[PDB]
Amino acid sequence: GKYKKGDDASYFEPTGPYLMVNVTGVDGKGNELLSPHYVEFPIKPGTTLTKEKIEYYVEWALDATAYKEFRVVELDPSAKIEVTYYDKNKKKEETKSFPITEKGFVVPDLSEHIKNPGFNLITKVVIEKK
Amino acid sequence: YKKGDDASYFEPTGPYLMVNVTGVDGKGNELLSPHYVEFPIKPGTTLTKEKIEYYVEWALDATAYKEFRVVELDPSAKIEVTYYDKNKKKEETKSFPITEKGFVVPDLSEHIKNPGFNLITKVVIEKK
């Protein structure tokens, strides 16, 4: 490609829990500047993900694009981290949502159901150049 | 088991980065006098200028300036580590410049378990 997202990034699917960032970067006046690029970051259950760590993960997800030099200004207040998996026991698909807060929430261990759950972050973020 | 959460009230027991920062504004007025923080680090890591910037920003979060961002780092900054060479029986000091390519954190195990990598700098910061 002309900008192949993935310097070295794993060629095969992740072997453990990961955070998937899919943000759309916008300016203040509501103009879309950057379309969502797929980016993965491994995470560990037991970790606490706060709003500040989320802000830094999205700034790092931009470094994978042409907007590598932008900083996060403001994260959509309604963003949440969602995870979807199939529960072995009940036999249904289930989805958990965690809100992005200052105190934060702890990464759950869903390994009993899936070894590599995908924690999804899909929002808009106002970004500005450094 | 990796290298510790919230960090010790005692001296670290692994390599660590000591951050000594003076925050000024775009006019060199001083906002924050020398402020010290410790971060555990792992030998084998490549420390780039950009990583250092993030560490100093994180160092600011424990101050009145947590909402500020690092705009520029003093170009004369350097990381220095001082230890006692166990073979030479003398004090030894290594300097690593801060550059875009960075440098790889050495393992000084043979001489010291918990070396402290010193970073003393002045940085321009501005509200986000």
Swiss-Prot record, chain A:
Transmembrane segments annotated in the record for this chain = none
Which GO cellular component terms are attached? extracellular region
Keywords attached to this entry: Pharmaceutical, Plasminogen activation, Secreted, Signal
The lineage's top-level taxon is Viruses
- Compartment(s) where it occurs, according to its Swiss-Prot or TrEMBL record: Secreted
One GO BP annotation here?
symbiont-mediated activation of host plasminogen
Relate the protein's function as given in its record. Answer: Potent plasminogen activator that converts plasminogen into plasmin. It forms a 1:1 complex with plasmin, which in turn activates other plasminogen molecules.
Annotated family: Belongs to the staphylokinase family.
Query: Which named protein is this?
Result: Staphylokinase
Q: Which gene encodes it?
A: sak
Included stretch of the parent chain: 34 to 163 of 163
Curated annotation (Swiss-Prot), chain B:
Location (main, coarse): secreted
Q: Where in the cell is it found?
A: Secreted
Query: What Gene Ontology cellular component terms go with this record?
Result: extracellular region
- Which Gene Ontology terms describe the biological processes this protein takes part in? symbiont-mediated activation of host plasminogen; symbiont-mediated suppression of host complement activation by activation of host proteases
Sequence similarity: Belongs to the staphylokinase family.
Q: What does this protein do?
A: Potent plasminogen activator that converts plasminogen into plasmin. It forms a 1:1 complex with plasmin, which in turn activates other plasminogen molecules.
User: What name does the UniProt record give this protein?
Assistant: Staphylokinase
Organism whose genome encodes this protein: Staphylococcus phage S phi-C (Bacteriophage S phi-C)
Full-protein interval shown: 36 to 163 of 163
